[PDB]
């Protein structure tokens, strides 16, 4: 509680990625929220300030409010570790593995975390021949996702152009069975806060998620397992589908979620009476 | 080819790990080998120079001759990516996963790369009961190995072996008996031969033998599978994959190394020399993959 325990804090935000503008907003609010708590927090945009200034100006820890690019892929995590600066959320492995959808799914398959069945296609494959085999094996519809803009494919005839197009963006393309007839949900994770699931509606976000309490409790538990087996910690989201029968299938994790005053973790927290400042203090307190 | 194409090159070496002295040796030889090729290469010890100096003094790429610690685990790779400096070997995912035994083996199991069966101990649990059930499930001997090394030959000695420990997660791996231990060095498309690793007590200290002693057809197939074992973890371009054979010649991969030694007694220069590729050529080949 004593804000002095946090010492001098950098709020990392902005950056060089396509999500710079969202990160500017996140970081401004995180900054406000930490200062509201009396914490000695300062803005630090690594696209503008030398990263060596963190150590040189006596910064001891950072709230990472970057999104995309080096803020989320293990790169700035590795650099912060190298410089001795503590930081929020996941470390190098968890950040890098969380962004690799292919290897995230292999680890889930080996650890009992359910995930939709999928095939891979390599750049330079006979995409038409692969498409035929994959429809025979998985059925339709399918999502075609780069391994590290997702396309939904509803007919067999549309699949080869989708593979070819995805292969332009990644040497490896994931072709994943779509889970139909249920719903889409996300579990926000912030320490051991009991944040409610959020249902994602075909763009709109719904709390309560519409599920019975016992099912919600189990799904939050499995979602935390899905996150922790990839080496992620403390802060993020796990996205998943249910089918019509209520079986869960995990899609991906997010290790750098938004902190705009309407992004999902603040919404989930506000719904249980935890305000924005309290949420950011809680997340930062995990670095103590 | 044209040395000017590499621009200004840092050789990262030294560092702060327990293997600093081997890195010092490797880095001194790599530096000389790049210079002998006419490349504009300079020493850069990150334990002594600020990493900001790379970008500030106009370095465009680095040969990573660090071993262990931040040179191998993705930390310095992330920092270099952050600074826009190209570097040899694996990037952040491959480097961090190649040091994580638990997830390395899960990925190998899900992708058909053979690896010894294993159990995890959460410490955590009753080490006495886990030890009993692991011996039942796996057999003996076992290795107790960090998840993120002790060879145990009786069931009695395991609970204590577990007690000692990463921590929270312990790997208990079946030992592969009656064959040999081997390594496959990887350097771009060089067809580097396998090397047999022979413990000092079995050589009538540790000895490295080329040729590895296996028939050509088998060696060809093992080089291919070893490259796949390295590549499925996200590692690229430069490193080793280590494996055992049992008595019948079945292979089991044990681990990868993404920052291998470059002394005159290290494995990649020996594998390369045996196919007529000298040291200077090997370092230029590795660096060329950064173009």
Residue numbers in the entry:
A (entry chain A): 4 to 151, 157 to 210, 226 to 311
B (entry chain B): 4 to 151, 158 to 174, 177 to 215, 225 to 311
Study authors write:
By using an ortholog rescue strategy for insoluble or difficult to crystallize targets, we increased our structural coverage of B. thailandensis essential genes from 31/406 (7.6%) to 49/406 (12.1%).
Here we report a functional and structural genomics effort that applied saturation-level transposon mutagenesis and next generation sequencing (Tn-seq) to identify essential genes in B. thailandensis, followed by high-throughput structure determination. We used an “ortholog rescue” approach to maximize structural coverage of these gene families, which are likely to be essential not only in B. thailandensis, but also in related, but more virulent, Burkholderia species, such as B. pseudomallei. Of these 56 targets, 25 satisfied criteria for being a potential antimicrobial drug target.
